[model samples]
Target: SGVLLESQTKITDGALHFDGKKLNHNTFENPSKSQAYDYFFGRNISAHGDAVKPYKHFVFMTWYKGGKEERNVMLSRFNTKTGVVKTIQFPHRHTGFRGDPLVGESHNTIGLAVSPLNGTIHMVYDMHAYVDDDETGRFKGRFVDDFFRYSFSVAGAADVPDDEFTLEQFVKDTSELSQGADDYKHLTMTGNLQDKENFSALTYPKFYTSDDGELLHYMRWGGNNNGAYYFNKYDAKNQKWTRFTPFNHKDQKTHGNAYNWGLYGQMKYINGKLRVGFQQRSANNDDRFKYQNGVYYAYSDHPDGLGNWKNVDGEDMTWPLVNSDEIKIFEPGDYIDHTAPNSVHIVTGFDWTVTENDDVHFITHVRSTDTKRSDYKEVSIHAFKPANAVDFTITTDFTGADSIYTSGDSIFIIGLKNGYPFVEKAKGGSNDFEVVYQQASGVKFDHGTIHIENGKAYYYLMEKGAGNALPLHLQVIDLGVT
Candidate 1:
């Protein structure tokens, strides 16, 4: 047998009891009507190993107040060894109320992660750029107009006692309007504009750890006329955070933006390297019909300094990859201005992953804003060896595929088939894929989290709910021995 699969359910009945303390509840509904004025977009849970104790810690989100009024974003921790659960409420308010249009989007209202090297709990939440809708106030507090503000919280055994944790001791930090803060430092300035206030826009705040167990944070900052990306390193031993610059306007003329519009992929710290992939957007352009370029990606060994960034060809890159031969595209101006050679339909959405063997895999769906003609619905997969640029392949067999996941030596491509959802797995280095799973009736894989534990791959997907609220399932599949 290749490998027998087994699954153990932890939460069901639409209710979760916190060990006689409180019975927490969660619900799935319209994105706008969700709690904390939020939607089921960003991360809600994280797993880590306890260094001081023999336990597996799971931190996740649990909503209260009937999941409607006064959304309280609470952090819940589960101990596998002791079966004890502890919950704490953060001081921040997810109110989910956007006062003005300047407040971009807040898909992932909150995020949680635990450093593997240490047992410190990292929490990031409340991503928004809000200001009053007045002549002066409109642009003053406008999120993307100049700068964006997001909050950060860090805690560990000292801050979070063995019995419980609270926001009181959680060190709070923010990327304020300027580079001055007592808790956290502002990002370095870059791009077409260099004013201190016009330095960086905070998007996709993520917490991770290095191979040797150092806490790390990664974020995307949009700037005037362009954007730059960076990751911060927290030196637990030295007791300070170090900033690393990976990409800025000098590297590329444009970067992606996330308003309350459509959601997209984010920068991630995978394996031991930082993985950056995004569609080029003209933020500094005066054109109303902004054009987006094709796919772009880069990798770096050190987050503190990403000087060795290169594409598949191993060529040091300051600009994003736009070569038509390297990765096929619809060509510029495919939708907006077909006559403009530089105009190309940007990648509206994408998913990327770097396997343990250093293999890079990405899938993207191309889009154009021209309403006169329907955009391309087919999705393409780009698999390559970053170390050997020539040793790569692109497969479009599984069209309309939305997500691609890697486990052990197999790659799983999940998407819609004949208006229904399906999943297919293929071995590495080959496009020969077989449908391993599928869904019947009117159902689709809306969104959920997927993680690998030991040698098994666990998929937690929330159903599309078609007309009513669909129950979520945690599907665990064994990928066999590596």
Candidate 2:
């Protein structure tokens, strides 16, 4: 799960190397270039390292021919001994849905994960805008305002000679994709129907794995302030999904008024316990993340439902803290800077990483509008390490980080400082972070994709030429070394 791209490249200490060529270029065949945006291209790759041992580590990505509509997913395996790549292409669903929704607009997105329990490749994609009528099969001439999703699993747990994956067992039919229903199941992971009719509305589908190697699916479904989160346990033994609500109130009054539960946390299986840390904002959609409530955490002994969750202090947490009385805000709101005097610091974006040792690392940029400077100057970056949810320690080693990417026990940071791109690396076993990579001038860090397999790290970057879209390159770094 978690969209990990596993590469079977042997560890090397030489300078980072790029082949100066892209694995595929047909991704840009469409003039509309619909897949160019994050909504369409994010999480398009998934890989596995130790699950399928001796068989080279694998990586998967979207491979398009003509455009977003004309594309198939690609899975590649790297042979560490011979240093060769073998690929397998997965076909698109035969549903009536087309990649093109509006005039000259088309997009295809996918969420992929590998089940450690069985070594099966799980994929969910063909997320379109509307639903189609089975009779006519022509979009039903209506709008469903939801994603038409498809789920499939390919068997690869046992060793296949020569690392060959066959499409004979791939499932693409509508019936199998549906979870015990005649109609295509609209995945509503949030477990709350108040904000959106379905889970595919405004939330992101995330794939995660448990400490025991069982795959779990998660999504944040409610509306801003009203949205709750849900996780589905993949029962490899039974080959079925069991959904559980991590945050929701059985009684409306106890839930209170806070609606949008902005996801600013990470989930990891530590010490055989599945723990989750997330943030909540009292603001609405238009308000953004302004009314910063605080961070909350919960854990479950097993992947299934374990009843209500308690805060880190071992206190019973009310279903929904409408008044913030029942549940305490781990991080107080006084630290936030609103536009006006004493305004809450608008959390523009934040990233969190949970280490193998159970340490939680977070980097965030809070907005501060000071009339003395430009509109952008109001933004300030802060990093913190919460040893437990009970305390927060300000960390100054890294700042101005737009986001943090984690591979194994290493953390990769990228963002801007004084209009320049900066990168840093924080290896496992140490809280101190140091700058390991940065760009002097021309390159932009937006198009790069990071993947860490075994002890090796790979970052795919786009080489800019004459300001036009240039070919993509690769940077491989060894994270096993400090």
Q: Which candidate is the best by TM-score?
A: 2
lDDT of 1: 0.44
lDDT per residue for candidate 1 within 47-155, as digits (tens), equals: 1111111114442333221123323444555443454445665443333323321111233234555555445555444444333244555334433322333323443
lDDT of each: 0.44, 0.44
Encode model 2's per-residue lDDT on 1-482: one tens digit a residue.
12222332322111111112222235323323333321222222212111122223444332222222433444344445456545455554212123332122122334556666676665555444444334365444333423545344456632344455455435434432343422323343232233233333323445666666777765554444455566667767666555455555422234554442444555544435656655655544445235454565655644553545455555765543333334443453444434353244545555555555555555554544343544433333334444444465653344455556555656666544443344566753345567765546554433444444454556544332221123333444555433
